[PDB]
Design a protein around this ligand. Sequence first.
Ligand SMILES: *[C@@H]1O[C@H](CO)[C@@H](O[C@@H]2O[C@H](CO)[C@@H](O[C@@H]3O[C@H](CO[C@H]4O[C@H](CO)[C@@H](O)[C@H](O)[C@@H]4O)[C@@H](O)[C@H](O)[C@@H]3O)[C@H](O)[C@H]2NC(C)=O)[C@H](O)[C@H]1NC(C)=O
Ligand SMILES: *[C@@H]1O[C@H](CO)[C@@H](O[C@@H]2O[C@H](CO)[C@@H](O)[C@H](O)[C@H]2NC(C)=O)[C@H](O)[C@H]1NC(C)=O
Ligand SMILES: *[C@@H]1O[C@H](CO)[C@@H](O[C@@H]2O[C@H](CO)[C@@H](O)[C@H](O)[C@H]2NC(C)=O)[C@H](O)[C@H]1NC(C)=O
Ligand SMILES: *[C@@H]1O[C@H](CO)[C@@H](O[C@@H]2O[C@H](CO)[C@@H](O)[C@H](O)[C@H]2NC(C)=O)[C@H](O)[C@H]1NC(C)=O
Ligand SMILES: *[C@@H]1O[C@H](CO)[C@@H](O)[C@H](O)[C@H]1NC(C)=O
Length: 215
Amino acid sequence: KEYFDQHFGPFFRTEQLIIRAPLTDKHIYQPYPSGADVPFGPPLDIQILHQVLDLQIAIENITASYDNETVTLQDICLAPLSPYNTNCTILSVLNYFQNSHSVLDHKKGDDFFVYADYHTHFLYCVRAPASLNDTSLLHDPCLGTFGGPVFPWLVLGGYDDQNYNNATALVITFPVNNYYNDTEKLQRAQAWEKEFINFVKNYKNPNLTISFTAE
Ligand SMILES: *[C@@H]1O[C@H](CO)[C@@H](O[C@@H]2O[C@H](CO)[C@@H](O[C@@H]3O[C@H](CO[C@H]4O[C@H](CO)[C@@H](O)[C@H](O)[C@@H]4O)[C@@H](O)[C@H](O)[C@@H]3O)[C@H](O)[C@H]2NC(C)=O)[C@H](O)[C@H]1NC(C)=O
Ligand SMILES: *[C@@H]1O[C@H](CO)[C@@H](O[C@@H]2O[C@H](CO)[C@@H](O)[C@H](O)[C@H]2NC(C)=O)[C@H](O)[C@H]1NC(C)=O
Ligand SMILES: *[C@@H]1O[C@H](CO)[C@@H](O[C@@H]2O[C@H](CO)[C@@H](O)[C@H](O)[C@H]2NC(C)=O)[C@H](O)[C@H]1NC(C)=O
Ligand SMILES: *[C@@H]1O[C@H](CO)[C@@H](O[C@@H]2O[C@H](CO)[C@@H](O)[C@H](O)[C@H]2NC(C)=O)[C@H](O)[C@H]1NC(C)=O
Ligand SMILES: *[C@@H]1O[C@H](CO)[C@@H](O)[C@H](O)[C@H]1NC(C)=O
């Protein structure tokens, strides 16, 4: 998957996870006021997205030690908003909701019907991932917290044509510095990667199967 990209150009490599929801069924979203039904695959169930967001947040918080120093993802990641540590690049469907549990829960509706919710936002954002403003009543941005668009074909798997709603897998990608010319900083990044591998290997959630992708 990320082999073909040159990982992320010559100076960054990617840690990448593929995530499926084996104990979750698909479900129907009915657009308001009228319109054809849109089925959403298992990993786009609202609760599995919340659970995948917790996984993602936990990954961001992983630390490793090398000598007496501490190594965070923020020390090694691609963060294009500013020259100094910042909001790390995470290619994920959760970045359409700015990696926020509350934004994912945003909804507009009356006492009984839903006008707009995460389905509505999703279906807009896969068509306009750089948008700062959903055209629906939510008016939420699509842009990821790292300051760039997340293209839908990079963060979803197992869908037909461009029906991203029918995805059977989520793909999560963190670019990190390869540090080809800096030996001391590469060792720190590799220390972090070892903790990342451990974290993923020991992560317990019956609702998710988490795998590393084949390079
Ligand atoms: C991937 O991409 C597409 C995303 O748009 C999917 O196409 C859509 O599929 C749905 C059905 O899943 C179509 O919705 C309508 O369904 C109703 C029937 O609704 C229910 O009611 C009857 C009983 O009255 C029940 O027996 C049925 O089983 C349903 O539970 C029909 O009346 C409509 O004519 C229509 O079929 C969408 O129209 C369709 N969208 C488009 C643009 O064609 C596609 O299914 C996905 N592919 C896979 C493999 O998952
Ligand atoms: C996001 O943009 C939309 C554009 O539709 C704004 O919503 C409405 O836009 C119309 C079109 O000119 C205005 O007449 C209304 O005043 C806007 N409605 C509201 C409730 O403000 C919306 O303001 C923008 N929001 C953000 C945060 O960018
Ligand atoms: C880094 O990303 C976070 C989101 O994870 C940004 O924080 C949001 O900032 C907006 C600014 O109006 C607030 O409305 C949100 O409530 C904030 N969200 C959270 C979860 O705190 C932050 O601004 C980004 N930093 C940079 C430098 O772009
Ligand atoms: C696995 O999924 C289940 C179902 O979403 C989670 O457990 C709770 O299930 C009850 C009963 O259906 C729901 O009312 C709750 O919404 C779920 N809990 C929460 C906090 O939302 C369960 O937590 C998931 N497992 C893990 C490890 O996250
Ligand atoms: C190569 O490493 C040195 C420090 O050892 C650093 O000053 C320099 O900026 C690095 N080169 C690049 C291209 O980042």
